[PDB]
Structure formats: C-alpha cells, structure tokens
C-alpha cells in the first residue's frame, strides 16, 4: 500500500514544515510576537513585525501553491479511477493493459483510506505447442480460408482451431469460405475438405 501511504506523508510533512516556519526570525529580533510587543513600543515594533508578516505570508503562499499543484495531481488520478470503475467494473474492457495484464474478465472495487483498490481478474494462456500452418487450402481449384480460426497440422492431418485455446476440429465447409482460385495465394496447400451434405444425400 505504498501509493496511498505516500500521499499521507506528502501532506503531513508539508503541514509540519509550515508549523516550524513560526520559529524563524526572518530578520526580526525574535520569532515570538508577544516578546516583541512587550519589549518595544509600537513605533519601533512596527518595523520588526513587518518582517515577520512578510515571511509568514510568503510561507503561506508557498504552502498553498504546493497544495494546488498536488491537488491537480490527485485529481488526475481520481479521473482515472472514475474511468476504471466505469469501464472495468461496469463492463468488460477491450483496451490493452488497461484493466490488468492479460485478457480482462472483470474487476472488483475495494475502499481504502483516501483511495481505491481494484482486483483485476485476467485470463492468461499457459502451455504452448507449435504446429505447421498454411494460409489457405486448395480443395479442388478453389481456395478455402477459415471462417474463424487458423489452420494447423500435427504432421498428418489438418484442423481449423480457434486462436487462443487449442481445440482441433475436422475441416468442413461450414467453417471455411471460398474466395477465388488456387495458385494465386502463397502457401496454399492441397487437402480434402469434407462435405456435410454429401453423406446425407448418399444415405
């Protein structure tokens, strides 16, 4: 919880500094107004008090300016928390590395002192295995591209599988679409594409 903690220190320290600024002469004979007043008449006390007034006014101005800049910085994070809540918690986000590292699934808010903690739930593939892939498949003078997925072969057969969880499926017409003729695409490979309707007609 460093971030939140840091905020608190940044504020507390500032206040402490401001308070200590009340013990500085700034050029006056003393840093205690009562002592100056009780040792000097107004005609000579005005000169001493002017320096203390100028110094403390300058210190207050410094404090307020620093707080304004720091508040702008904090508002820049409030405006991002209010966006994470709108897009991660209240819906699923397609932005990359926004709602967590991986493919976002959901999120949960939790309150913390002067802040909010999200628990981004994400999906991450784990074990990898590689195959040989060909962009098209020439059944008979017709290129075939996978409707949704990618072609891959384990060395003997060709399967069209989704691109994020290995799941081989026999290649048929319903998951492939035709466009053009063979010999126009680099990498097209011969293969047989089953016909779902043909066996029923034969049957």
Ligand X SMILES: *[C@@H]1O[C@H](CO)[C@@H](O)[C@H](O)[C@H]1NC(C)=O
The footprint of ligand X (CB under 6 A) covers 130, 138, 154-157, 182, 186-190
187 binds other proteins (CB under 8 A): yes
170 binds other proteins (CB under 8 A): no
Say how far apart CA 7 and CA 116 lie, in whole Å: 13
Give the pairing of strands 158-161 and 176-178. Answer: unpaired
Measure CA 56 to chain center.
43
Say how far apart CA 151 and CA 160 lie, in whole Å: 4
Q: Which residue is nearest to ligand X (CB)?
A: 187
Contacting residue, 140, 165, 196, 201, with other proteins by CB under 8 A:
165
Three-class secondary structure of residue 183 per DSSP: coil
* Least Cβ distance, residue 76 to other proteins (angstroms): 7
| CA angle in degrees (0–180, nearest 5) for 31-33-39 | 100
Query: Toward other proteins, which CB reaches closer, 37 or 192?
Result: 37
Say how far apart CA 116 and CA 107 lie, in whole Å: 12
Joined tokens for residue 87: 């897009």
Total of residues contacting other proteins (CB under 8 A): 96
194 binds other proteins (CB under 8 A): no
* Least Cβ distance, residue 115 to other proteins (angstroms): 5
Nearest residue to 170 via CA among 152, 182, 144: 152
The interface with other proteins within residues 52-111 (CB under 8 A) comprises 53, 55-57, 59-60, 62-63, 65-67, 69-74, 76-78, 80-81, 84, 94-98, 100-103, 105
* Least Cβ distance, residue 159 to ligand X (angstroms): 8
Measure CA 142 to chain center.
45
33 binds other proteins (CB under 8 A): yes
User: Could you tell which of ligand X, other proteins, none binds residue 182, using a CB distance below 5 to 8 A set by kind?
Assistant: ligand X
């Amino acid at each position: 919880l460093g971030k939140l903690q840091d905020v608190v220190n940044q504020n507390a320290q500032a206040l402490n500094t401001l308070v200590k600024q009340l013990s500085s002469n700034f050029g006056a004979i003393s840093s205690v107004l009562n002592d100056i007043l009780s040792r000097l008449d107004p005609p000579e006390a005005e000169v001493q008090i002017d320096r203390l007034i100028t110094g403390r006014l300058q210190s207050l101005q410094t404090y307020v300016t620093q707080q304004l800049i720091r508040a702008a910085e904090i508002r820049a994070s409030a405006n991002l928390a209010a966006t994470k809540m709108s897009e991660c918690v209240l819906g699923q986000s397609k932005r990359v590395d926004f709602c967590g590292k991986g493919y976002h699934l959901m999120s949960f808010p939790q309150s913390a002192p002067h802040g909010v903690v999200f628990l981004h739930v994400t999906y991450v593939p784990a074990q990898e295995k590689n195959f040989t892939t060909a962009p098209a498949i020439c059944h008979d003078g017709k290129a075939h591209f996978p409707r949704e997925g990618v072609f891959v072969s384990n060395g003997t057969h060709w399967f069209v599988t989704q691109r994020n969880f290995y799941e081989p499926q026999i290649i048929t017409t319903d998951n492939t679409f035709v466009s053009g003729n063979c010999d126009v695409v680099i990498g097209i490979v011969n293969n047989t594409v089953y016909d779902p309707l043909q066996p029923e007609l034969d049957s």
